[PDB]
Ligand binder design. Structure first.
Ligand SMILES: [Cl-]
Ligand SMILES: [Cl-]
Lengths: 165, 160
């Protein structure tokens, strides 16, 4: 599975993304600390996950799934965040059209403040289509999404959840 | 989702794996056809799934699931076979694979060589990968026989 590191975790390892083996969230995280032990102190509190850390599987907080026991497929992606704080995060989504993201933002009560700019409670979401990816004769649009604000983490993951649909 | 191409599909596209969008098996196959149109008739029969092709989701034949309606997560991996196969598994211990092979009625013919009803499984450790301070074992698994596809996929299921 792929592991995306944010904020503190990124600064502490020099890495933004890693590919690590594991059939459950726990297995992947145990391998993460075997690879970068500097993260052990912040990721685990005793045997379980540290209470202030947030781990998301395809946009879903794993705590509301099966936590460390959550099964995952080999190609799954996890997002790891240290204690919540105001910030800015970005991600490029494949085949996630602007109009569709807009519909989600509108359905969440977001207010349009410009073309590709929406304000949500505690965050501002900015998005623009970048260079499409080419797979054979198929052009796959790519959408760059940036989220910043006190609740940037929350909305950033809500968007990842939406895109997974 | 990721799509692994085997035999015919691999040689034609010249690709072993592709990253394609889609929330269901059907959608991914649709985009696959878009990427390589020459596969339309070899995968679809109008709006339905072809009958000679085989599609597996994390080692499970989708025909026994929900067919084209089978839901898919972004991290899903599909293996597609047209009418020998191999994969290198990361951190898939030999003793574990062996326990599965035996549970499936397999017979140990030698070191890293087991025989199954319809196939022969060959496996060996290759150069490990390295991520940070962690060494990740790499097990290369090769499957041949009349039922190689089926067994290769059950091993993929077991590894996951
Ligand atoms: Cl947990
Ligand atoms: Cl069996």
């Amino acid at each position: 599975p792929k592991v995306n590191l944010y904020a503190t975790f990124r600064d502490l390892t020099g890495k933004s993304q890693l590919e690590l083996p594991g059939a459950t969230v726990g297995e992947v995280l145990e391998n993460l600390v075997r690879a970068y032990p500097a993260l052990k102190e912040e990721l685990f509190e005793g045997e379980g996950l540290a209470e202030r850390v947030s781990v998301f599987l395809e946009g879903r907080d794993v705590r509301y799934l099966q936590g460390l026991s959550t099964p995952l497929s080999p190609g799954a992606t996890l997002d790891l965040f240290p204690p919540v704080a105001g910030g800015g995060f970005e991600r490029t989504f494949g085949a996630f059209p602007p109009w569709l993201l807009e519909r989600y933002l509108e359905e969440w009560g977001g207010t349009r403040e410009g073309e590709g700019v929406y304000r949500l409670p505690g965050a501002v979401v900015r998005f623009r289509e970048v260079e499409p990816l080419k797979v054979g004769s198929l052009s796959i649009p790519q959408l760059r999404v940036e989220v910043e604000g006190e609740e940037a983490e929350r909305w950033f993951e809500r968007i990842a959840f939406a895109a997974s649909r």
